[PDB]
Amino acid sequence: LPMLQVALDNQTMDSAYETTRLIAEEVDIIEVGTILCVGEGVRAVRDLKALYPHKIVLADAKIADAGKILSRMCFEANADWVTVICCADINTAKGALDVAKEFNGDVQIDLTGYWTWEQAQQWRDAGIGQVVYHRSVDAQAAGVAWGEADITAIKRLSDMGFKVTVAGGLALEDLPLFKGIPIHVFIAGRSIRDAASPVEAARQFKRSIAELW
Amino acid sequence: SLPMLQVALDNQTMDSAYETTRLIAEEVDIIEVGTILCVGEGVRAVRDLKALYPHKIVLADAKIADAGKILSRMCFEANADWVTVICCADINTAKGALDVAKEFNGDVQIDLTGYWTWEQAQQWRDAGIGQVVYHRSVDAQAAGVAWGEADITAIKRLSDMGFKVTVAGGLALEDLPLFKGIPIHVFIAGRSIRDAASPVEAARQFKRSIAELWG
Ligand SMILES: [Mg+2]
Ligand SMILES: [Mg+2]
Secondary structure (H helix, E strand, O other), rough: OOOEEEEEEEOOOOHHHHHHHHHHHHHHEEEHHHHHHHOOOOOOHHHHHHHOOOOEEEEEEOOOOOHHHHHHHHOOOOEEEEEEEEOOOHHHHHHHHHHHHHHEEEEEEOOOOOOOHHHHHHHHOEEEEEEEEEOOOHHHHOOOOOHHHHHHHHHHHHHHEEEEEEEEOOOOHHHHHHOOOOOOOEEEEEEHHHHOOOOHHHHHHHHHHHOOO | OOEEEEEEEEEEEEEHHHHHHHHHHHOOEEEEEEEHHHHHOOOOOHHHHHHHHHOOOOEEEEEEOOHHHHHHHHHOOOOOOEEEEEOOOOOOHHHHHHHHHHHOOEEEEEEEOOOHHHHHHHHHHHHOOOEEEEEEEEHHHHHOOOHHHHHHHHHHHHHHHEEEEEEEEOOHHHHHHOOOOOOOEEEEHHHHHOOOOOOOHHHHHHHHHHHHHHO
């Protein structure tokens, strides 16, 4: 089944713990959001893995360069997975992946914004096995919806051999759009954190995934 | 004008960064809180460095990929002067960061590490972005990628489009003559200053060479 990842896009640890104390056991993957990486630094990764060592912890660093340095900082802090942003030089993805392998972790290419199918082939040739197909939250705020071109692009990525994570303002009602595609992970940030009942929000995601897959 | 000098603080902890700033704060124009220090320490690095050096321009090299308003506000509330947005970001990300920047009388640069297009550059100018960082990837540099003809051509084209151009990416003193005759706004040096036997003298050599090459 597709896994459920909660994005902790909080500015401080104590704000993040407001969410994790409700739903840590309701999800599969705990993401240290970019917001939290910037707010608190890599201590966020170390602290959350110590709290939830049985969960996969993703550091959503969106590394643009200095792949070896930034990945090593995240993996020394006990990250399982780290993200590299799609425009990074191929040697950045390669460097992050080499480090990831030392720690038995993995790298995902986050596909927010502008990238090309040629770059996607490069990531595959470099041994990248995961991508995050990601509607920009700012594009979302400007009225960009999920659409059929996204579905086509997700299937294409899956056919290239990537495990695909889907993200970007996902609500429960969006899940049927992706039906029939072997999605690796759905990310939910706001639709869990900001729900009247975060626990019900998470369980509904899992319920719906179970029905659909 | 002479190109200014920006020191990149790509340290993992504040104390490591202060080992550099206590030597060169007054030898450089812009203090960059490197991406590595943003990740190492969080946005406190911005707040703390601005408090030590309030008279200096402080740049947060956040390389914002999305959530432009949120991330830019965090940096500006920590008293940054400038923030970076990575070239691949959706145009609304750059716009959102700029909107926030104007509230704080700050500014946004687009960092041009990695893959981008000329069409994207026109969108940046149209949205009112006035600064770009022409950036050789440090990982590309480590795989042997040299400064080349195509870099001079693109920098010139960016300048002709109306951007002030910062040059960065493993910059060494001997690289500066490659850029002579182009109105570079800022040169960034990280390792070439931080890792020198004498950071003070390294910074001074950059300033001397700049004053010769652009004088
Ligand atoms: Mg995220
Ligand atoms: Mg930098």
